[PDB]
Amino acid sequence: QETVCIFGTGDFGRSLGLKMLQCGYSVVFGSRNPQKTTLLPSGAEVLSYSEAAKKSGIIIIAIHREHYDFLTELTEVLNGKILVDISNNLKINQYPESNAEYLAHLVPGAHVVKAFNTISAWALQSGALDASRQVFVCGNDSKAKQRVMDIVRNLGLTPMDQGSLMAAKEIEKYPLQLFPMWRFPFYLSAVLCVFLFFYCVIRDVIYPYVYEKKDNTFRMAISIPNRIFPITALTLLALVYLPGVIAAILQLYRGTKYRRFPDWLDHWMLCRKQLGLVALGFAFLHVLYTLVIPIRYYVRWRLGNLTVTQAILKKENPFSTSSAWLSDSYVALGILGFFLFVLLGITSLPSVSNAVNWREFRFVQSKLGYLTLILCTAHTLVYGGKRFLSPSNLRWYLPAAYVLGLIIPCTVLVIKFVLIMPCVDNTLTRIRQGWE
Amino acid sequence: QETVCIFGTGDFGRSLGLKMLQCGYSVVFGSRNPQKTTLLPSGAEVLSYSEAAKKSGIIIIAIHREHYDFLTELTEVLNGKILVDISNNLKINQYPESNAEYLAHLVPGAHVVKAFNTISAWALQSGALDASRQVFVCGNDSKAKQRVMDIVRNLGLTPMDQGSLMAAKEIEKYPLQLFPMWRFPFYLSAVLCVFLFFYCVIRDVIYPYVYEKKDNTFRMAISIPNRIFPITALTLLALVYLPGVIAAILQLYRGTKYRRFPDWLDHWMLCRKQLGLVALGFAFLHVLYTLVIPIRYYVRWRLGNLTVTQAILKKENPFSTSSAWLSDSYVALGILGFFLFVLLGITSLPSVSNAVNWREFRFVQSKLGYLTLILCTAHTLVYGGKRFLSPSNLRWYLPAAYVLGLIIPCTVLVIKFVLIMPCVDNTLTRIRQGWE
Amino acid sequence: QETVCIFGTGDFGRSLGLKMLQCGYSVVFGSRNPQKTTLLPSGAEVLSYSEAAKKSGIIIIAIHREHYDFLTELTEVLNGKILVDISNNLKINQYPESNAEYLAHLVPGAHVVKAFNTISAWALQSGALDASRQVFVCGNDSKAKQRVMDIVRNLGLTPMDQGSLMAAKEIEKYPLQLFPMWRFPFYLSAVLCVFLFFYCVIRDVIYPYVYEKKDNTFRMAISIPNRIFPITALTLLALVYLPGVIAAILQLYRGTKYRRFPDWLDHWMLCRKQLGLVALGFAFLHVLYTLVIPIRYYVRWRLGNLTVTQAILKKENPFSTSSAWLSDSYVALGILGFFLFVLLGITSLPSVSNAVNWREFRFVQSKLGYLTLILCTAHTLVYGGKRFLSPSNLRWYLPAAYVLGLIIPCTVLVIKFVLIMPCVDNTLTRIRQGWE
Ligand SMILES: Cc1cc2nc3c(=O)[nH]c(=O)nc-3n(C[C@H](O)[C@H](O)[C@H](O)COP(=O)(O)OP(=O)(O)OC[C@H]3O[C@@H](n4cnc5c(N)ncnc54)[C@H](O)[C@@H]3O)c2cc1C
Ligand SMILES: Cc1cc2nc3c(=O)[nH]c(=O)nc-3n(C[C@H](O)[C@H](O)[C@H](O)COP(=O)(O)OP(=O)(O)OC[C@H]3O[C@@H](n4cnc5c(N)ncnc54)[C@H](O)[C@@H]3O)c2cc1C
Ligand SMILES: Cc1cc2nc3c(=O)[nH]c(=O)nc-3n(C[C@H](O)[C@H](O)[C@H](O)COP(=O)(O)OP(=O)(O)OC[C@H]3O[C@@H](n4cnc5c(N)ncnc54)[C@H](O)[C@@H]3O)c2cc1C
Ligand SMILES: NC(=O)c1ccc[n+]([C@@H]2O[C@H](COP(=O)([O-])OP(=O)(O)OC[C@H]3O[C@@H](n4cnc5c(N)ncnc54)[C@H](OP(=O)(O)O)[C@@H]3O)[C@@H](O)[C@H]2O)c1
Ligand SMILES: NC(=O)c1ccc[n+]([C@@H]2O[C@H](COP(=O)([O-])OP(=O)(O)OC[C@H]3O[C@@H](n4cnc5c(N)ncnc54)[C@H](OP(=O)(O)O)[C@@H]3O)[C@@H](O)[C@H]2O)c1
Ligand SMILES: NC(=O)c1ccc[n+]([C@@H]2O[C@H](COP(=O)([O-])OP(=O)(O)OC[C@H]3O[C@@H](n4cnc5c(N)ncnc54)[C@H](OP(=O)(O)O)[C@@H]3O)[C@@H](O)[C@H]2O)c1
Ligand code: HEM
Ligand code: HEM
Ligand code: HEM
Ligand SMILES: CCCCCC(=O)OC[C@H](COP(=O)(O)O)OC(=O)CCCCC
Ligand SMILES: CCCCCC(=O)OC[C@H](COP(=O)(O)O)OC(=O)CCCCC
Ligand SMILES: CCCCCC(=O)OC[C@H](COP(=O)(O)O)OC(=O)CCCCC
Ligand SMILES: *[C@@H]1O[C@H](CO)[C@@H](O)[C@H](O)[C@H]1NC(C)=O
Ligand SMILES: *[C@@H]1O[C@H](CO)[C@@H](O)[C@H](O)[C@H]1NC(C)=O
Ligand SMILES: *[C@@H]1O[C@H](CO)[C@@H](O)[C@H](O)[C@H]1NC(C)=O
């Protein structure tokens, strides 16, 4: 039966130690005081640091980085042992090297393996290990690394091997972050949903209060967020396919592809997935606010008054078939534009993305990605055809609030249309392999 | 070229043997009667048990557990061989030890590897291996276990290593179950959709038949299941976040977190995912029944009569703006409450759940999980404001059937609000690390 | 520090070489002209072919298959080296053996490992490696194959081991295909959406133009694709469960299950997933076109005229409760039939499909798959009950265009109902294990 020593009897020391007694391991704890040990599992004795290290070959140090000082006092006991470093830091970039690098320079005669820092101490105890299922294992000694990965499999976890000990810097960065790539689409969308809220409140509830004095302030429940949410979804969709256009222009002037993107475009290349899925989250709200139009009281009342007024005044509507074209056209373009929008979101799942090679992925994400941005722009051009862009449409001196949201998507489609023409695109094909 | 012996020429023996002839293996079957062999592949000879075992090093026993008796008669031939045990049982907990444990005690001088019990014999033959793609491999000998995993890769399958031979008890439990965790949310929801069907039939089709005698029995097609399905979705959502409240209370009285939950709460901790996804399945039905309201005949007729009666009787509706607030408010709260409801369901996918550490998962599942249960409770409080809870709302002595569904969600939100206050929550922070 | 030689300084040679300088490898390029080397990374010298191969043990040949001729001129240098073959072909089935097989016959004294052909040269450079994350590694020498997989882990990629070198034929087929299994459901659906477009244009816009001359040509925006898309979704759903019925008939005549399906049924067995997900894509369009009915101008106008005409002509509608049954029945059957339709699509995800054994998968995909095809057929039978199949329903001599779409689903449900009866099904149970 295997023996696993655990330095430190703290929170994660008890939780990892009690998980190993349930899987058939003889755990020998090591603490500063083996005399007074109140909370400990049943079949696990507690010894000194030098005494417990003489019993196993795998030593898990469940201590913080600041108290790594005593390991130099017993470096002749730790010769040939497997020291599993599990520690995290309180914040990113607190120390220059990682902990497993620093633990290797303290005890040079021992094989250091980074593991177990992703999982939490409560997930081992309660058994509610759902996102803390994978354990990232990295180390230099390949024989010692396969032995630690056998413990992770016997504890019901899934070891993901991360290579050599150089990858321990990124593993300690992993449990500290809270959506690091989603920060720029959240901040861009929040400053675009606040500006476009104050832009529609000034048009729809303030302008009918100054002129033609009426309350009209219920609009900011559904009727104003059904203008914020599609225009935010259309703008953020156009901000997705804009770096691929700016980078295509920036390669034509340079004449080569082997130079580096200018450090603001490169960070905005990597947030396209994050900008795309936030734009799907707002387009999905625009669908739900639109499909619930005929349930609202204002829509039932307005269609109720318009029918009664037509009933007592014997004038009639002669069914203009031109307006039946437009109202069935922009609704149809919005449905095809949302079907492909969802289809880009299905492919964004990390299991669907791995069952797809880079040609099938480029066909969905780029060929059917502009075709989303064409249909979602034609959905709001044909909707703009009913309003005609007349001078009776701007309230003070500021227009109908969707034509501001057509500046970025119609800019992307014009510049992309230049890059499709063979006087330019045949140069791009010769530049994706190398050119002067 | 490799040689793989297969004991037993039955259903899975032919299916696994014919799959290995298509991948470049020389398969030697072993049966009780090598003389009469009718159904067999082409390039695979059939020998005796002792004769076929002298030709390979990997022996796959395609026999049941009851006929393991003959292997003790030839235990001197099986020395050093790799015996791959593939057997299942007819029911869970039929024998005390697993089959691979029992196969190791019969032949102690052989390395036993559990594999191939997850896949079916038809999925190897027809090639329709879709859920039977992963093959769970476990065994003590690490050199013999990597050799069996090389066969699984060459057969187009994906070996998932499960550790030592102690994990063979759970692998044999795997192909027998049929949604074992989903049993409690299915039985709770079925006894809550049956009671709430008879509660709405008594109010909506029986009470208009006794008093004011009219048929009114078409309601149980859409109009009654649009009352069952949201209240079942709201109750099951409140039953998700109720164990996290009961466990928080039960840690304050104990003063420590290291004691065990009382065996009914612990089984209801593990079914939160299962209760949550069933509650999303009923909320998704409540969306589809609601968005199809203006297509129904009863809604078109009632809005048709109410307009014609207002047309021939010249009284008018003066557009009460107060009721335009409420009807745009509970509809908006239902959309935000369903958007985050879906967002919890996207994170529940086992590929999205693994691309997310436990802080980003706790932010979605708990911070944005109560915020779902707040918005979905405020969606049905504001809907209850239109009905005012007047005494003309209860039919015999029993109320309007959604206020029964507000008992559990408003209980969770009150007790959670006590646990947020810093006179209690600062004790919870000191108790998630250890306290007296 | 490790040394990795790369033959060939081309497009993928620079991209893979610059990725390895960023991970702590000393890369030594090999080219035909080490004198003139313009584009190259900083810390990577360029030598001759025989000179650079004498410095490392891992040699990555970044050259095409046609220029493999020079490796026979230096086969005494490549003894014991690990030659990583990364090449692709311009088209499928261009050469009889794969490249890694052909590279092994050129240099017999070297271990050949196929890797890196899935990823692209731009994904290494730009860092936008999203679908080119997995690297398929296969080779005969297990010690050399684990060494190449350590490079793939250190480059931030994920090595998927594919077994021996026999699997290199399928890995070179992998980056060339563009949805190979989706071709038959795309071509079947396109020839069924074109025929059913011309069938509804002849009924709905040509027949009201010849008789009772009116424009009526706006129908082909929403109103005609809301007839194409559900009938295509219902037909393709019936074409899913039809091979399982034809194969069940074809096993009863044969009397055994061990014979081979006749090569058109076998290719249509494998496209059931592909036919099923395309049928979900059209049913999801039928939902979105249907839920947007009360927003269209034609529906608002027609319900506006029908109310005003009822307001000025004092006749009334007495609320036939029979038509309130039917219109709430087929709408309810369409919602239950679409809920299970989506539930089959959630299980089709390759992460949900792997978290499910073959009994839970057969319960969803087959037991709840016919129950989808029953409810979606009863959704269009009850919708056909409102139209009664009168002789005033066919326009010239051709019927109401959904009853053509009931031929295939009602054929499958009748023949499946024969196979459920125990005079037939007890023979199928005795034939799924072997019978004469
Ligand atoms: C809902 C949604 C989900 C999304 N999910 C994802 C996701 O999961 N992952 C993701 O990455 N994006 C995602 N996106 C973003 C979008 O799909 C990407 O932009 C897409 O992958 C490529 O778009 P592109 O037009 O910029 O093409 P790109 O190829 O990225 O950009 C074109 C330019 O890139 C350069 N380039 C491209 N290929 C090469 C080459 N072989 N050699 C040299 N230069 C080259 C050239 O300069 C070319 O002009 C998503 C978007 C949405 C709306
Ligand atoms: C649609 C949907 C999908 C869902 N999917 C999932 C899913 O995939 N997986 C899943 O697990 N749940 C899932 N849930 C359930 C829900 O998300 C969980 O309850 C959530 O993970 C945590 O909720 P909670 O408030 O109970 O928090 P919890 O943290 O589970 O409960 C709080 C209590 O737990 C204890 N506790 C928590 N953390 C610690 C700690 N570090 N140390 C000590 N004690 C601690 C304390 O007693 C604390 O008061 C889903 C729910 C829905 C509605
Ligand atoms: C939205 C959607 C998604 C889908 N996704 C998938 C998917 O991911 N993967 C997929 O495979 N299909 C998928 N399908 C197709 C459908 O689910 C399959 O047909 C289903 O897996 C089985 O259906 P079946 O009735 O043909 O059953 P089958 O079992 O495939 O066919 C029955 C016949 O198969 C033979 N047979 C079955 N089991 C055995 C056995 N043990 N021994 C001998 N003979 C046997 C017998 O002849 C039997 O009569 C999908 C369909 C839809 C609509
Ligand atoms: N959820 C988690 O707790 C979690 C999760 C992931 C990773 N980790 C990591 O696991 C390790 C355990 O930390 P923890 O959170 O569980 O807290 P902790 O173990 O309770 O406190 C740190 C441990 O250091 C030991 N130690 C030895 N000398 C010490 C000294 N001079 N001063 C203070 N302590 C000394 C202590 O045990 P003795 O005095 O008895 O010897 C003490 O148990 C940490 O590195 C942590 O980053 C924890
Ligand atoms: N879909 C599947 O079939 C499937 C799936 C997963 C796992 N398995 C497992 O694979 C194994 C094969 O079982 P099976 O379903 O395919 O049925 P089976 O093989 O047809 O019957 C059991 C086999 O035991 C052999 N055997 C040897 N001595 C025997 C004896 N005294 N009495 C009876 N049989 C004897 C028989 O072959 P000979 O008499 O010719 O030697 C017979 O082929 C089982 O353990 C099963 O749990 C099967
Ligand atoms: N996106 C990709 O580029 C990609 C992706 C996956 C796989 N691959 C594979 O990686 C390999 C590299 O090809 P590549 O696309 O990057 O084009 P390439 O390397 O620019 O051209 C082929 C290479 O062959 C070398 N070579 C040696 N003798 C040659 C000769 N007589 N004639 C022509 N070339 C000779 C050349 O380098 P020197 O003359 O300087 O020695 C040249 O760099 C290919 O096998 C490719 O299938 C490429
Ligand atoms: C289910 C599919 C969709 C339907 C039925 C739909 C329908 C509509 C309708 C009816 C309007 C007019 C709103 C009103 O009456 O005030 C509208 C506006 C709009 N839609 Fe959509 N839409 C859909 C999807 C999309 C998508 C995917 C986008 C792109 C992100 C989009 C962008 C817009 C924009 C920009 C407006 C104008 C916003 C305004 O100024 O009011 N829609 N949509
Ligand atoms: C798309 C989003 C949603 C919309 C538009 C919506 C709309 C509505 C409407 C209009 C009603 C009144 C039904 C009627 O007219 O008889 C209602 C009732 C209700 N909704 Fe929602 N809802 C949504 C999502 C949700 C969610 C996510 C929940 C929580 C599970 C929920 C819980 C309820 C409850 C409990 C009722 C009262 C049931 C009754 O007694 O009739 N809804 N909803
Ligand atoms: C959200 C769920 C669904 C709803 C509310 C729904 C509703 C309807 C409605 C109202 C119609 C009549 C269309 C019209 O007024 O012209 C219809 C037609 C039809 N539906 Fe559905 N449906 C649903 C899902 C499905 C599904 C999943 C299928 C099967 C693929 C299906 C198959 C059909 C067929 C075949 C027709 C007849 C097409 C025609 O001739 O017009 N539906 N549906
Ligand atoms: C508050 C927003 C939280 C959203 C969390 C989330 O969904 O992202 C988790 C992860 C994304 O994480 P990273 O790509 O690693 O940033 O999974 C997905 O790819 C999303 C696919 C979803 C496709 C439908
Ligand atoms: C009759 C109900 C059958 C449902 C089957 C199912 O969906 O669960 C399969 C599995 C769940 O299986 P377990 O978590 O292992 O119980 O995948 C999911 O996590 C669901 C995610 C779904 C998120 C949208
Ligand atoms: C133009 C159509 C492109 C569609 C691409 C696609 O979705 O398939 C990618 C892959 C399917 O690829 P293969 O099964 O390998 O053919 O993932 C899925 O299983 C789909 C699950 C989706 C379940 C919702
Ligand atoms: C209603 O429609 C009919 C034909 O569809 C038309 O003749 C009649 O004038 C309309 N009634 C109105 C517009 O009041
Ligand atoms: C219809 O609305 C107008 C203003 O919107 C109002 O003046 C008129 O009284 C309404 N007609 C009714 C209530 O019949
Ligand atoms: C409207 O409905 C009432 C009862 O709901 C009925 O008595 C009345 O006749 C209807 N008005 C019509 C049909 O014009």
mmCIF file of N, CA and C and ligand atoms in Angstrom, chain B residues 120 122 128 130, chain C residues 237 240-241 243-245 247-248 251 257 261 269 272-273 275-277 279-280 341 344-345 347-348 353 358 361-362 364-366 370 416 419 428 431-433, ligand 3:
data_model
loop_
_atom_site.group_PDB
_atom_site.id
_atom_site.type_symbol
_atom_site.label_atom_id
_atom_site.label_comp_id
_atom_site.label_asym_id
_atom_site.label_seq_id
_atom_site.Cartn_x
_atom_site.Cartn_y
_atom_site.Cartn_z
ATOM 1 N N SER B 120 -20.503 -1.270 -26.890
ATOM 2 C CA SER B 120 -21.433 -2.345 -27.192
ATOM 3 C C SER B 120 -20.947 -3.122 -28.404
ATOM 4 N N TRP B 122 -22.719 -3.972 -31.001
ATOM 5 C CA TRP B 122 -23.263 -3.469 -32.255
ATOM 6 C C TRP B 122 -22.534 -2.217 -32.710
ATOM 7 N N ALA B 128 -21.437 2.718 -35.773
ATOM 8 C CA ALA B 128 -22.183 3.836 -35.199
ATOM 9 C C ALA B 128 -21.814 4.019 -33.729
ATOM 10 N N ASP B 130 -21.006 6.320 -31.146
ATOM 11 C CA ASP B 130 -21.154 7.745 -30.898
ATOM 12 C C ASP B 130 -21.067 8.080 -29.413
ATOM 13 N N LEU C 237 -36.517 14.670 -40.711
ATOM 14 C CA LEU C 237 -36.647 13.905 -39.479
ATOM 15 C C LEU C 237 -37.151 12.497 -39.750
ATOM 16 N N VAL C 240 -34.443 10.238 -41.004
ATOM 17 C CA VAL C 240 -33.507 9.790 -39.983
ATOM 18 C C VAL C 240 -33.877 8.399 -39.497
ATOM 19 N N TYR C 241 -35.141 8.201 -39.153
ATOM 20 C CA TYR C 241 -35.590 6.970 -38.531
ATOM 21 C C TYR C 241 -36.069 5.951 -39.537
ATOM 22 N N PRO C 243 -33.821 4.463 -42.043
ATOM 23 C CA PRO C 243 -32.876 3.336 -42.136
ATOM 24 C C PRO C 243 -32.963 2.345 -40.999
ATOM 25 N N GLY C 244 -33.295 2.784 -39.787
ATOM 26 C CA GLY C 244 -33.479 1.833 -38.707
ATOM 27 C C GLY C 244 -34.694 0.954 -38.880
ATOM 28 N N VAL C 245 -35.632 1.368 -39.723
ATOM 29 C CA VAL C 245 -36.779 0.542 -40.055
ATOM 30 C C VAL C 245 -36.459 -0.376 -41.225
ATOM 31 N N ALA C 247 -33.469 -1.435 -42.065
ATOM 32 C CA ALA C 247 -32.524 -2.429 -41.569
ATOM 33 C C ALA C 247 -33.194 -3.470 -40.699
ATOM 34 N N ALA C 248 -34.258 -3.098 -39.995
ATOM 35 C CA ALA C 248 -34.976 -4.080 -39.201
ATOM 36 C C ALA C 248 -35.752 -5.041 -40.084
ATOM 37 N N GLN C 251 -33.182 -7.491 -41.746
ATOM 38 C CA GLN C 251 -32.661 -8.550 -40.894
ATOM 39 C C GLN C 251 -33.667 -9.672 -40.694
ATOM 40 N N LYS C 257 -27.854 -11.261 -38.184
ATOM 41 C CA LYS C 257 -27.402 -9.881 -38.148
ATOM 42 C C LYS C 257 -25.959 -9.727 -38.591
ATOM 43 N N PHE C 261 -24.732 -4.670 -44.642
ATOM 44 C CA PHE C 261 -25.748 -3.811 -45.222
ATOM 45 C C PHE C 261 -25.349 -3.365 -46.627
ATOM 46 N N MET C 269 -26.750 4.996 -42.857
ATOM 47 C CA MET C 269 -26.663 4.822 -41.413
ATOM 48 C C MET C 269 -25.778 5.881 -40.779
ATOM 49 N N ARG C 272 -27.055 9.807 -40.146
ATOM 50 C CA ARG C 272 -28.251 10.089 -39.364
ATOM 51 C C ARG C 272 -28.057 11.299 -38.474
ATOM 52 N N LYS C 273 -26.879 11.413 -37.859
ATOM 53 C CA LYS C 273 -26.548 12.600 -37.083
ATOM 54 C C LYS C 273 -26.551 13.833 -37.962
ATOM 55 N N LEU C 275 -28.198 14.216 -40.894
ATOM 56 C CA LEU C 275 -29.585 14.476 -41.260
ATOM 57 C C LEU C 275 -30.397 14.984 -40.090
ATOM 58 N N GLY C 276 -30.032 14.608 -38.881
ATOM 59 C CA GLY C 276 -30.815 15.030 -37.748
ATOM 60 C C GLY C 276 -30.560 16.467 -37.377
ATOM 61 N N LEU C 277 -29.308 16.905 -37.464
ATOM 62 C CA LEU C 277 -28.985 18.269 -37.079
ATOM 63 C C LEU C 277 -29.382 19.273 -38.146
ATOM 64 N N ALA C 279 -32.172 18.791 -39.855
ATOM 65 C CA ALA C 279 -33.604 18.858 -39.593
ATOM 66 C C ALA C 279 -33.920 19.703 -38.374
ATOM 67 N N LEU C 280 -32.994 19.793 -37.422
ATOM 68 C CA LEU C 280 -33.176 20.713 -36.308
ATOM 69 C C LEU C 280 -32.946 22.150 -36.740
ATOM 70 N N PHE C 341 -37.000 17.854 -29.668
ATOM 71 C CA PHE C 341 -36.148 18.031 -30.871
ATOM 72 C C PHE C 341 -34.848 18.714 -30.441
ATOM 73 N N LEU C 344 -32.640 16.340 -28.345
ATOM 74 C CA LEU C 344 -31.771 15.503 -29.155
ATOM 75 C C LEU C 344 -30.559 16.270 -29.649
ATOM 76 N N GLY C 345 -30.685 17.583 -29.828
ATOM 77 C CA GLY C 345 -29.555 18.360 -30.293
ATOM 78 C C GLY C 345 -28.555 18.671 -29.209
ATOM 79 N N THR C 347 -27.838 16.525 -26.786
ATOM 80 C CA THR C 347 -27.126 15.263 -26.640
ATOM 81 C C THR C 347 -26.156 15.023 -27.791
ATOM 82 N N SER C 348 -26.360 15.676 -28.928
ATOM 83 C CA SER C 348 -25.464 15.532 -30.062
ATOM 84 C C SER C 348 -24.141 16.249 -29.885
ATOM 85 N N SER C 353 -22.269 13.859 -25.421
ATOM 86 C CA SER C 353 -22.349 12.499 -25.934
ATOM 87 C C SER C 353 -21.337 11.583 -25.261
ATOM 88 N N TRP C 358 -24.135 4.063 -23.520
ATOM 89 C CA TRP C 358 -24.940 3.746 -24.691
ATOM 90 C C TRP C 358 -26.372 3.353 -24.360
ATOM 91 N N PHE C 361 -27.927 6.958 -24.032
ATOM 92 C CA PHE C 361 -27.918 7.573 -25.347
ATOM 93 C C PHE C 361 -28.971 6.946 -26.243
ATOM 94 N N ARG C 362 -29.155 5.629 -26.147
ATOM 95 C CA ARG C 362 -30.211 4.973 -26.906
ATOM 96 C C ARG C 362 -31.589 5.363 -26.392
ATOM 97 N N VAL C 364 -32.357 8.423 -25.229
ATOM 98 C CA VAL C 364 -32.642 9.753 -25.745
ATOM 99 C C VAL C 364 -32.823 9.702 -27.252
ATOM 100 N N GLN C 365 -31.870 9.101 -27.955
ATOM 101 C CA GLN C 365 -31.839 9.207 -29.406
ATOM 102 C C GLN C 365 -32.866 8.328 -30.099
ATOM 103 N N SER C 366 -33.358 7.280 -29.452
ATOM 104 C CA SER C 366 -34.293 6.376 -30.101
ATOM 105 C C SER C 366 -35.663 6.344 -29.446
ATOM 106 N N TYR C 370 -38.353 8.748 -31.686
ATOM 107 C CA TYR C 370 -39.656 8.477 -32.275
ATOM 108 C C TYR C 370 -40.734 9.317 -31.622
ATOM 109 N N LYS C 416 -42.941 1.099 -38.251
ATOM 110 C CA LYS C 416 -42.386 0.923 -36.915
ATOM 111 C C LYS C 416 -43.408 0.315 -35.971
ATOM 112 N N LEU C 419 -43.260 -3.355 -36.159
ATOM 113 C CA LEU C 419 -42.076 -3.905 -35.513
ATOM 114 C C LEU C 419 -42.143 -3.861 -33.991
ATOM 115 N N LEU C 428 -36.880 -10.072 -33.228
ATOM 116 C CA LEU C 428 -35.760 -9.133 -33.247
ATOM 117 C C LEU C 428 -34.874 -9.251 -32.016
ATOM 118 N N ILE C 431 -32.661 -12.092 -32.545
ATOM 119 C CA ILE C 431 -31.792 -11.943 -33.699
ATOM 120 C C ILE C 431 -30.678 -10.937 -33.445
ATOM 121 N N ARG C 432 -30.776 -10.148 -32.373
ATOM 122 C CA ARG C 432 -29.700 -9.263 -31.948
ATOM 123 C C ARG C 432 -28.628 -9.987 -31.148
ATOM 124 N N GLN C 433 -28.778 -11.293 -30.940
ATOM 125 C CA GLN C 433 -27.728 -12.090 -30.329
ATOM 126 C C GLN C 433 -27.231 -13.211 -31.226
HETATM 127 C C1 LIG D 3 -31.563 16.211 -33.669
HETATM 128 C C2 LIG D 3 -31.009 14.836 -33.919
HETATM 129 C C3 LIG D 3 -29.723 14.530 -33.495
HETATM 130 C C4 LIG D 3 -29.178 13.270 -33.716
HETATM 131 N N1 LIG D 3 -27.906 13.015 -33.274
HETATM 132 C C5 LIG D 3 -27.411 11.849 -33.484
HETATM 133 C C6 LIG D 3 -26.073 11.590 -33.020
HETATM 134 O O1 LIG D 3 -25.348 12.391 -32.439
HETATM 135 N N2 LIG D 3 -25.632 10.326 -33.282
HETATM 136 C C7 LIG D 3 -26.339 9.336 -33.924
HETATM 137 O O2 LIG D 3 -25.806 8.238 -34.093
HETATM 138 N N3 LIG D 3 -27.604 9.586 -34.358
HETATM 139 C C8 LIG D 3 -28.100 10.776 -34.144
HETATM 140 N N4 LIG D 3 -29.370 11.030 -34.563
HETATM 141 C C9 LIG D 3 -30.096 9.974 -35.273
HETATM 142 C C10 LIG D 3 -30.973 9.120 -34.374
HETATM 143 O O3 LIG D 3 -30.899 9.597 -33.035
HETATM 144 C C11 LIG D 3 -30.500 7.671 -34.441
HETATM 145 O O4 LIG D 3 -31.304 6.983 -35.388
HETATM 146 C C12 LIG D 3 -30.586 6.940 -33.110
HETATM 147 O O5 LIG D 3 -29.285 6.930 -32.524
HETATM 148 C C13 LIG D 3 -31.091 5.521 -33.230
HETATM 149 O O6 LIG D 3 -32.306 5.504 -34.005
HETATM 150 P P1 LIG D 3 -32.861 4.164 -34.607
HETATM 151 O O7 LIG D 3 -34.369 4.053 -34.377
HETATM 152 O O8 LIG D 3 -32.436 4.019 -35.979
HETATM 153 O O9 LIG D 3 -32.169 3.077 -33.712
HETATM 154 P P2 LIG D 3 -31.066 2.036 -34.172
HETATM 155 O O10 LIG D 3 -30.652 1.211 -33.024
HETATM 156 O O11 LIG D 3 -29.913 2.805 -34.779
HETATM 157 O O12 LIG D 3 -31.760 1.215 -35.278
HETATM 158 C C14 LIG D 3 -32.584 0.078 -34.954
HETATM 159 C C15 LIG D 3 -32.076 -1.146 -35.670
HETATM 160 O O13 LIG D 3 -30.639 -1.218 -35.551
HETATM 161 C C16 LIG D 3 -30.237 -2.561 -35.333
HETATM 162 N N5 LIG D 3 -29.674 -2.664 -33.993
HETATM 163 C C17 LIG D 3 -29.734 -1.731 -32.993
HETATM 164 N N6 LIG D 3 -29.149 -2.101 -31.880
HETATM 165 C C18 LIG D 3 -28.677 -3.372 -32.166
HETATM 166 C C19 LIG D 3 -27.965 -4.315 -31.404
HETATM 167 N N7 LIG D 3 -27.580 -4.112 -30.141
HETATM 168 N N8 LIG D 3 -27.649 -5.488 -31.992
HETATM 169 C C20 LIG D 3 -28.026 -5.698 -33.254
HETATM 170 N N9 LIG D 3 -28.698 -4.887 -34.071
HETATM 171 C C21 LIG D 3 -28.998 -3.733 -33.463
HETATM 172 C C22 LIG D 3 -31.478 -3.431 -35.530
HETATM 173 O O14 LIG D 3 -31.603 -3.806 -36.894
HETATM 174 C C23 LIG D 3 -32.580 -2.466 -35.105
HETATM 175 O O15 LIG D 3 -33.843 -2.815 -35.654
HETATM 176 C C24 LIG D 3 -29.944 12.299 -34.371
HETATM 177 C C25 LIG D 3 -31.228 12.602 -34.799
HETATM 178 C C26 LIG D 3 -31.770 13.858 -34.573
HETATM 179 C C27 LIG D 3 -33.162 14.145 -35.048
#
